[PDB]
Design a protein around this ligand. Structure first.
Ligand SMILES: [Zn+2]
Lengths: 361, 176, 49, 111
């Protein structure tokens, strides 16, 4: 403030290579000159963190060191930026604060590292399936999932939803159909951008038609890219199958994917019946792929007409006439005891006891 | 909401106030199983209410499979009578309902992504592992398994009124 | 020019096919990243040539 | 150093892997007469899973447990009917019936 008049309108203005505080009313300065570090001394001085100037980073067990080095190599083999490494090691140090977590086996620490890098990639919109992570872990996926559920129940951190478009972008590029390598004939080669756009449209169609809820995404993505590859050239690709396509692409095909494919084909049929030329053509499960592009041209009205006539698992679509049958009200318990012969029926006779002892003698 | 949930499983424990010999009750009973190599407790199954109980040597016993609190009490009294018939001073003391699991249905599909987008801090949706969304409401501390089929499973309550209020509170969230 | 604007390196990833043993079973590979070599401009692999 | 003992195998080329997350435990199927003999063994011994597993060399304990649970869930009426009727413990004729079931399943595999 101003020492004489008391005006608190002090403004920082850059003078001729000089910093100072001055009031705009009387032009009087209250504090002039500023002390800044020189780069000549900045390169000499070594930085110290509060993680080291407090005694911490020395109480790091050999197991905690192994865990953090595992986090480092896991985020490095994925070719992740150093920001992902920092966030992952921060999450690991935060999760290691619990007594129940620090006292565990090597499998537990490894699946914890896997879940930590999974959460790290989930944070910054980086899609990565749990299968690709479990592939780099020396453990099974069931215990990995159990520990994941346990730690997300114990911590309750933010878990974004897996985006389908980014997952398609990550999954379509893994195929070798884009390059005309000698292992694949030139007839199967296609453009990456067109196939990616077709697969994105097909997975959007699956999303709006209840084909991403509950079921694993990867089989739906495989079915979508297979339909896209078939529609790009049904002249020389309709005769193939999903197994042939997966063998040619050198990618392990999902088991339910074919079934998912069938469902998607059914959806296509439910669209082809709405279009006049297609409903006159009288297509089938095989000849519907060639018009998939047309189905993707006006997919909105087609799915609206299909839904105005929802999607559910086939187990419940068998016309259930009895939905949630009401059980009979039998909450009675008699007066004190309904009967006593049940005990006589449940007890073992001496002959039965002797037979049991003789059977496993 | 016009829909009433249906309780399916009841879990309740009871102390007998006395020590038991597991080999004696396992040797003189036909519906009793005891394999100390893996599990050191006695498994018994009563048929009329269709329920299963676990008996421990420390005097504690637990029941599962009941539909209501009265059926669980009846099963506990039946097991107490069975234990008393084998020459043991079993008592029916400290009986309290521990957990209840029920099922219901809404008859319309549910978007499991809109829920996790609007109620992220109350649910943990992972379709890659389990198809059903897991919702954890903290005010009654109820865990709900939701499916695209619309049928919802509720657990974690202590009384039927808790299940009813949890369902009537989660119904507008599912409808919206 | 995009690498000049985005302040990032202009490199190409190295692919490698190898063979090894996990449980005394010969497991082979086809394409595995091991690093990135910076690509000099107007070289054989450069797009400008 | 072995001499021509192992063959090269291509596995896991480090691409995007499908998330299986499933362990389909192999379970031997159940036949009609096998179900009948399991029911009679239950009626003769009770609900002792250990004793049933001991006298079932062709089956497993967890398989017997799953079958018993499925039966209690689906055919509780037949379960109670079998539990009401009693039959003394047989050993020699039980082994004869086991040999008969072995011959029957061998003939079935021959078909
Ligand atoms: Zn002044």
């Amino acid at each position: 403030r101003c020492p004489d008049c008391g005006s608190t309108e002090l403004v920082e203005d850059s003078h001729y290579s000089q910093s100072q505080l001055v009031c705009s009313d009387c032009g009087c300065v209250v504090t002039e000159g500023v002390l800044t570090t020189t780069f000549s001394d900045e390169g000499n001085l070594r930085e110290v963190t509060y993680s080291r100037s407090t005694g911490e980073n020395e109480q790091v067990s050999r197991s905690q060191q192994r865990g953090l080095r595992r986090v480092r190599d896991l985020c490095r083999v994925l070719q992740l930026p150093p920001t992902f490494e920092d966030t992952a090691v921060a999450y690991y140090q935060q999760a290691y604060r619990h007594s129940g977590i620090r006292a565990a086996r090597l499998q537990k620490k490894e699946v914890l590292v896997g879940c930590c890098v999974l959460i790290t990639c989930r944070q910054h919109n980086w899609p990565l399936t749990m299968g690709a992570i479990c592939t780099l872990l020396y453990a099974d996926l069931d215990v990995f999932s159990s520990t994941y559920m346990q730690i997300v129940k114990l911590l309750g951190l933010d878990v974004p939803s897996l985006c389908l478009a980014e997952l398609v972008k990550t999954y379509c590029s893994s195929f070798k159909l884009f390059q005309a390598s000698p292992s694949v004939p030139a007839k199967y080669v296609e453009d990456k951008e067109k196939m990616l756009s077709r697969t994105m449209q097909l997975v959007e169609l699956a999303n709006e038609t209840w084909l991403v809820t509950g079921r694993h995404p990867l089989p739906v993505i495989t079915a979508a890219t297979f339909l896209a590859w078939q529609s790009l050239q049904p002249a020389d690709r309709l005769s193939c199958s999903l197994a042939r396509f997966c063998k040619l692409a050198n990618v392990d095909l999902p088991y339910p994917a074919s079934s998912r494919l069938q469902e998607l084909l059914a959806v296509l049929l439910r669209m082809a019946e709405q279009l006049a030329w297609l409903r006159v053509l009288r297509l089938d499960k095989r000849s519907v792929v060639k018009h998939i592009g047309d189905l993707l041209q006006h997919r909105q009205s087609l799915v609206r007409s299909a839904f105005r006539d929802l999607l559910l698992p086939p187990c419940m679509l068998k016309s259930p006439k009895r939905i949630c049958p009401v059980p009979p009200v039998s909450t009675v318990t008699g007066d004190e005891n309904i009967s006593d012969s049940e005990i006589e029926q449940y007890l073992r006779t001496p002959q039965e006891v002797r037979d049991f002892q003789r059977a496993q003698a | 909401s016009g829909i009433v949930p249906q309780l399916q499983n009841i879990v309740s424990t009871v102390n007998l106030g006395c020590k038991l010999d597991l080999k004696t009750i396992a040797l003189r009973a036909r519906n009793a199983e005891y394999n100390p190599k893996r599990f050191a407790a006695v498994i018994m199954r009563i048929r009329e209410p269709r329920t299963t109980a676990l008996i421990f040597s420390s005097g504690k016993m637990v029941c599962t499979g009941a539909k209501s609190e009265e059926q669980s009490r009846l099963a506990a009294r039946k097991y107490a009578r069975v234990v008393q018939k084998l020459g043991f001073p079993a008592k029916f003391l400290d009986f309290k309902i521990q957990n209840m699991v029920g099922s219901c249905d809404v008859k319309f599909p549910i978007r499991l992504e809109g829920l996790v987008l609007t109620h992220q801090q109350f649910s943990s949706y992972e379709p890659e592992l389990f198809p059903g969304l897991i919702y954890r409401m903290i005010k009654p501390r109820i865990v709900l398994l939701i499916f695209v089929s619309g049928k919802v499973v509720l657990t974690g309550a202590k009384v039927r009124a808790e299940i009813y209020e949890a369902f009537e509170n989660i119904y507008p969230i599912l409808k919206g | 020019h995009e690498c000049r604007l985005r302040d990032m390196t202009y490199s190409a990833p190295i692919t490698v096919d190898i063979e090894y043993t996990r449980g005394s079973q010969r497991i082979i590979r086809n394409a595995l990243p091991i690093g990135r070599m910076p690509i000099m401009l107007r070289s054989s692999n450069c797009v400008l040539t | 150093c072995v001499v021509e003992e192992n063959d090269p195998i291509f596995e896991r080329g480090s691409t995007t892997t499908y998330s299986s997350f499933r362990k389909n435990y192999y379970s031997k199927p159940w036949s009609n007469k096998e179900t009948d003999m399991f029911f009679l063994a239950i009626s003769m011994v009770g609900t002792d899973f250990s004793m049933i597993g001991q006298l079932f060399p062709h089956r497993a304990r967890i398989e017997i447990k799953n079958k018993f649970k499925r039966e209690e869930k689906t055919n509780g009426w037949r379960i109670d009917k079998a539990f009401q009727e009693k039959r003394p413990f047989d050993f020699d004729f039980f082994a004869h019936l086991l040999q008969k079931v072995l011959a029957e399943e061998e003939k079935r595999k021959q078909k």
